[PDB]
Design a protein around this ligand. Structure first.
Ligand code: PYV
Ligand code: PYV
Lengths: 172, 172
C-alpha cells in the first residue's frame, strides 16, 4: 500500500528514521511515524509541503490559516489555524521549527489554541528514490505528544492529500 | 464548502432529510447527518456507491471486503470487512438494509465484528440538482448509533472520496 514501505525503501531510510523519526520517550509521551509513497519528483512534493503559510493546500480539516503578511516564513514564525467544525479542536497556534530546503526537512510545534493536545511536535522529511528510469518520493511524518488514534488518522489523510496534489501536478 | 448545503439545496432537500435522515432518538443513542456536493451526474454517483460488495472503491480505511461469490447483492446480504491497522476497529460485518435503484437510496447496519460501535445503522441518498445547463449531485449520509467525532470523520472522508472518484470519471 502507498503507506507501507517496501523492505528496500525501509533499508534506504534507516538513517533518516533514526535521525528524525525516533523518540526517546518519557512515560508521559507517545509517538507515531507515518509514511506515504508519492509518484512525483521529490522537489515538487517539497515545494508544496514547505509552505508553512498555506497548510490548507496540502492538509484536511482547516477552515482558515492566518500568518503575518508580507514576510517570508522562517523558523520561529507562527500560524493561527481555525479547524473545521466537528473535531476535538477549534484553533491551533503553531510554530515553524525546521525549514531545511537542502535536506527537505520541515516541522512544527503546537504552542497554543483550543484543543486537547499538549506538547505536540512533528517532523516531515521528503526522500528521493530512483530505480532504472523511474524517480518517486517517500514522505515520512512523525510526531510526539503528551498522553493517538485520531492524530494518526489526521496525519495519514494529510499525507494522502499531499500525494493527490503532487501526482495531479506531475501528470504530463 | 462542498460539505455545506446552500440554502437553496437545503430547501430542496427538506423532505428527503425528514424522510431518511432525521431520528427520534432514545436517550442512549445519537445521530449525525453529512452532506457532499459532487460535480457529476447523479446516476454516475449512484452507480459507484450502490456497489455493496466493493466499499473499498468509494471508502477509506478498508483492507479487504469479503462477500459471497456469484451472487448479485440484495437486501439482506452481508459483507465481512477488515479495517486497516491503527483504527478503533479491526473487523466489521455489515448487512445491506436498503437498495432502491429508482430513488437512489442505500443503507447498511453493522451487525458484528471487532469494534466499539453498538447498533450502528446508516442511510445514504443521492440527489439530482439542475440550474440552467448545469447538473450536479448532492449525497446525504446519516447514521444512528448507541452511545461520534471519529465516525463523523470517517463519513466525511468517505463522502469526499466518492466525490473524487465520480468527478474523475466525469471529466470529458
Ligand atoms: O490545526 S491542525 O490542522 N494542526 C495540524 C495537526 C494537528 C494534529 C495532528 C496532525 N496535524 C489540526 C487538525 C486536526 C486536528 Br483533530 C487538530 C487537533 C488539534 C490541533 C490541531 C489540529
Ligand atoms: O468497516 S468500516 O469501513 N465500516 C463503515 C463505517 C463504520 C463507521 C462509520 C462509518 N462507516 C469501518 C471503517 C472505519 C471505522 Br473507525 C470503523 C469502525 C467500526 C466499524 C467499522 C468501521
Amino acid at each position: 500500500m502507498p503507506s507501507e514501505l517496501t523492505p528496500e525503501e525501509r533499508s534506504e531510510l534507516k538513517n533518516s528514521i533514526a535521525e528524525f523519526h525516533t523518540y526517546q520517550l518519557d512515560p508521559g509521551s507517545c509517538s507515531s511515524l507515518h509514511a506515504q509513497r508519492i509518484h512525483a519528483p521529490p522537489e515538487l512534493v517539497w515545494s508544496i509541503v514547505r509552505r508553512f503559510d498555506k497548510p490548507q493546500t496540502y492538509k484536511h480539516f482547516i477552515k482558515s490559516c492566518s500568518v503575518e503578511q508580507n514576510f517570508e516564513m522562517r523558523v520561529g514564525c507562527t500560524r493561527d489555524v481555525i479547524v473545521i467544525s466537528g473535531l476535538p479542536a477549534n484553533t491551533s497556534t503553531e510554530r515553524l521549527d525546521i525549514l531545511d530546503d537542502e535536506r527537505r526537512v520541515t516541522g512544527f510545534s503546537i504552542i497554543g489554541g483550543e484543543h486537547r493536545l499538549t506538547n505536540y511536535k512533528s517532523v516531515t522529511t521528503v526522500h528521493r528514490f530512483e530505480k532504472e528510469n523511474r524517480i518517486w518520493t517517500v514522505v515520512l511524518e512523525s510526531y510526539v505528544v503528551d498522553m493517538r488514534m485520531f492524530a494518526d488518522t489526521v496525519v495519514k489523510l494529510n499525507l494522502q492529500k499531499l500525494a493527490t496534489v503532487a501526482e495531479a501536478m506531475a501528470r504530463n
